Amino acid sequence: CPRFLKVKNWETDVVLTDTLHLKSTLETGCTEHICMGSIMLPVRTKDQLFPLAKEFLDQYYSSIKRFGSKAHMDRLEEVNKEIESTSTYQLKDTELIYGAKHAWRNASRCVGRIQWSKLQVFDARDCTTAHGMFNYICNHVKYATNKGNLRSAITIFPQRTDGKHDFRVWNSQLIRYAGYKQPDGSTLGDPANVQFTEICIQQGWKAPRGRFDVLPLLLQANGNDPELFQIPPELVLEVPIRHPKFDWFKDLGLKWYGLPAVSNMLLEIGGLEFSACPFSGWYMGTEIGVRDYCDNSRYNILEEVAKKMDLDMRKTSSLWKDQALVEINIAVLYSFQSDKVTIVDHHSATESFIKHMENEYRCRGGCPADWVWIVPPMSGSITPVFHQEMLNYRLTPSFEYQPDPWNTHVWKG
Amino acid sequence: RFLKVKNWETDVVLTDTLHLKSTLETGCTEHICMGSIMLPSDVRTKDQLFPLAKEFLDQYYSSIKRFGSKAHMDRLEEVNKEIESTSTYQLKDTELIYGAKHAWRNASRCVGRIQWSKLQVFDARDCTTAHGMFNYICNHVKYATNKGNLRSAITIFPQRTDGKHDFRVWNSQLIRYAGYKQPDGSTLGDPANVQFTEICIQQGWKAPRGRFDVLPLLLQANGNDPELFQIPPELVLEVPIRHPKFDWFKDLGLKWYGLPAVSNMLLEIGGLEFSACPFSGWYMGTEIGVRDYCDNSRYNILEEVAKKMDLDMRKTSSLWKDQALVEINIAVLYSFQSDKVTIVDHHSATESFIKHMENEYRCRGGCPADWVWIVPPMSGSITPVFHQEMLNYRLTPSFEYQPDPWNTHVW
Ligand code: HEM
Ligand code: HEM
Ligand SMILES: CNCc1cccc(-c2cncc(CCc3cc(C)cc(N)n3)c2)c1
Ligand SMILES: CNCc1cccc(-c2cncc(CCc3cc(C)cc(N)n3)c2)c1
Ligand SMILES: C[C@H](O)[C@H](O)[C@H]1CNc2nc(N)[nH]c(=O)c2N1
Ligand SMILES: C[C@H](O)[C@H](O)[C@H]1CNc2nc(N)[nH]c(=O)c2N1
Ligand SMILES: [Zn+2]
């Protein structure tokens, strides 16, 4: 724990000094003997709860310039009594909004954080049933989509109590396409969603069995068995994919949804755990064009595209894969822009992230960042983040991973 | 303590036990990960040296299936006596070769390690002068180049003694191009070599002030002041860069050297330190086409190529940078292949490394790997290493960074 750590940008020689890392609480997974930097995935008693609450409230009252005020001390007193009496406590609306914005600010794997202070927070802590969850999520989807002019948002459902009454969205993302495993081993739709699609089918979903079927919401309230709901199609904004020069690209039959919305993570604020907290922003082009379309384990279209460009596919050293990859990503950006749906290219997004990061070092004393996730999955070193040294550490409030609900849920019947 | 790594493309999970043998530290802690830091953070004494020797001799004699044998114990005793008596010791040829091959095997930032056992080791421990060093290095360069059919090699000069008599190659690579300032204010040649080029000039180099001037070697023997030598031009194989479809590409006047040879690292074996140990393999295309040619702080040619292709350079979202990048890298590979000079593309190299990883996990119980360096600087996720979890840890024998000699050297 040196008081100071420096990071260097090897393109510009800009050096920054991190002090924020001293406020780090959680573990990284690394030790002095091993680095787990590329590892994807490396109730609560009142004893451990009041320090977490106090730490959070101190940060909140500092940020509003009321540290040590009567208001601050009264709040600490109030939360303390509430914890020792009820074993938990409730956040004020202001503290909830602060908490969610800062969990985003602290998200070291997110390149989009220049936007963190612009987040619409929907307080759904009065929700009690799956039907109510469905209503709240429809409203979030409509607000966030904004007819293509996307707005960042998060909807926060009631916190965990004894761990037996959890709210969960079983979908990993609010909008996703179904995947179907055929008897011959082939896959229709999104191969990554085969298992979840099967769960949905088992729960009674009638699958149209096409290549781009929007999955139903599977929603769990208060620890009850989850229930199926179909998002109104008119709320699901989609973009057919075409290419500005290649007129055959449309006949690939590709489209994607406009709203990226993560729904399987846990929001921790002041020791409290919000197990259902779907959040959404707008896409960076490579997410679709590189990963969704071109991962071997996803739609995997590099082959067909390269064929239609008539590239030399007999030797990898022709770089036919790289050539097709670029065209596909051009087409995604082109399509979204043409239909006036918010999207950002990986050049713009990484450039903005560097400006954000430098701003954060100056005003906050640091910006935790995961290089392995921040660097885009194509053209890495012609973006500025590639050459930027980053320190990764964990601040709270935070977004955390949690087990998949189908592995832990106790079925009521 | 027994760690698992998962491939998220194939769902294959491997179990690493080799990390438990890790000696050196990572830079990371439980509170902060320094995985993206390029460089995280004086003789050895008698007491420090003998356990290092034993650890090494133990793994050597294990490797030849004679662990705990008479010859094993005999060698341990002999080295022990030699250290006690002379405060250092000398490696047997067999041990030197083993150690060098395993330093490569342990290089966590190297994607090319499937080749680790096929390394030609040149023992230059009898070298005493800078002229001797020059001769050894010329022979290395000729052997490794092999008229375009490259062969991996390392040349190992005398080990550090009291630290006052270090052998050093002052160049960071055996072959690189000069960089010059401008009254124009711009930069001619390789911008990353302006400082070194000035030192060469200050030491008396006659610079032709061109865009691709092979730098002279600056060689330091036995702690003496470094001396200048020019590598015979006919030993430095270069490749003119042309494109298989774009006839205008040759007009850029681009070329690059065929031999990638690192000369500024320190080789540690059994606690002994070899401060001058140039090694060489063959290029992966992206090294030249992505980094050397398109880094903004390097030859920075993206804009020029983009213009020749007549792409829309008004908006970043047209991905004109990305399109030019691919074409530049197509040309590099095409040029090397056409001139019959060994090169590997990033798809081929990363596929090899995945096979090497699986081999190492199966027969060794792990493979230390730095994902940040192993994933190529373009088209990351369409190479298999992107989806491969890797554990990074430090085994010896190893190649280590050391301070640049011009900051340490007392003249
Ligand atoms: C507003 C525009 C945004 C952009 C352009 C953006 C960009 C990205 C991208 C490209 C990723 C990587 C996704 C992946 O590879 O699976 C990511 C990850 C992440 N983002 Fe952002 N994001 C945005 C908004 C948000 C918001 C509103 C939140 C929360 C309130 C957020 C929190 C996170 C978190 C927690 C991750 C890690 C995801 C994981 O571990 O699976 N982001 N972001
Ligand atoms: C024979 C084919 C080889 C290939 C294709 C290959 C590939 C690579 C590449 C692409 C890098 C990254 C270099 C950079 O970005 O600056 C690298 C680094 C490295 N390689 Fe290999 N290499 C080969 C041979 C060797 C040999 C023969 C040795 C040692 C005897 C070696 C040891 C290392 C080390 C220590 C690094 C890290 C160097 C640093 O930290 O700057 N490699 N290799
Ligand atoms: C570790 N990868 C998790 C994963 C795999 C496959 C697909 C996804 C995924 C599916 N649909 C939407 C997303 C959106 C991710 C995201 C979230 C947010 C808030 C913003 C943004 N630009 N991107 C991811 C995630
Ligand atoms: C951290 N980057 C150090 C650096 C910066 C700029 C240029 C270089 C460089 C220059 N010339 C040759 C190299 C060769 C690296 C290498 C070594 C070996 C043994 C094999 C290989 N394929 N590639 C690197 C290295
Ligand atoms: C800051 C970051 O660590 C730095 O730019 C690294 C990234 N990955 C790299 N990977 C390789 N192979 N070579 C490099 O020089 C670098 N540079
Ligand atoms: C094993 C490795 O950590 C894994 O493939 C990571 C690499 N970097 C990533 N980066 C982003 N943004 N998203 C990802 O899913 C991944 N996957
Ligand atoms: Zn680490």
UniProtKB/Swiss-Prot annotation, chain B:
Homodimer. Interacts with DLG4 (via N-terminal tandem pair of PDZ domains); the interaction possibly being prevented by the association between NOS1 and CAPON. Forms a ternary complex with CAPON and RASD1. Forms a ternary complex with CAPON and SYN1. Interacts with ZDHHC23. Interacts with NOSIP; which may impair its synaptic location. Interacts with HTR4. Interacts with SLC6A4. Interacts with VAC14. Changing residue 283 to H: 50% decrease of nitric-oxide synthase activity. Heme b binds at residues 110, 401. It comes from the Eukaryota. This is Nitric oxide synthase 1. The gene is Nos1. Changing residue 283 to F: No decrease in nitric-oxide synthase activity. Signal peptide: none annotated. It is found in: Cell membrane, Sarcolemma; Cell projection, Dendritic spine. Isoform N-NOS-1 is expressed in brain and colorectum. Found in the Auerbach's plexus of the enteric nervous system. Isoform PNNOS is expressed in the penis, urethra, prostate, and skeletal muscle, and coexists with the cerebellar nnos in the pelvic plexus, bladder and liver, and is detectable in the cerebellum. It comes from Rattus norvegicus. L-arginine binds at residues 173, 282-283, 287. The chain holds residues 299 to 716 of 1429 of the full protein. Ubiquitinated; mediated by STUB1/CHIP in the presence of Hsp70 and Hsp40 (in vitro). Belongs to the NOS family. Produces nitric oxide (NO) which is a messenger molecule with diverse functions throughout the body. In the brain and peripheral nervous system, NO displays many properties of a neurotransmitter. Inhibitory transmitter for non-adrenergic and non-cholinergic nerves in the colorectum. Probably has nitrosylase activity and mediates cysteine S-nitrosylation of cytoplasmic target proteins such SRR. Inhibitory transmitter for non-adrenergic and non-cholinergic nerves in the colorectum. (6R)-L-erythro-5,6,7,8-tetrahydrobiopterin binds at residues 36, 372-373, 386. The PDZ domain participates in protein-protein interaction, and is responsible for targeting nNos to synaptic membranes. Mediates interaction with VAC14.
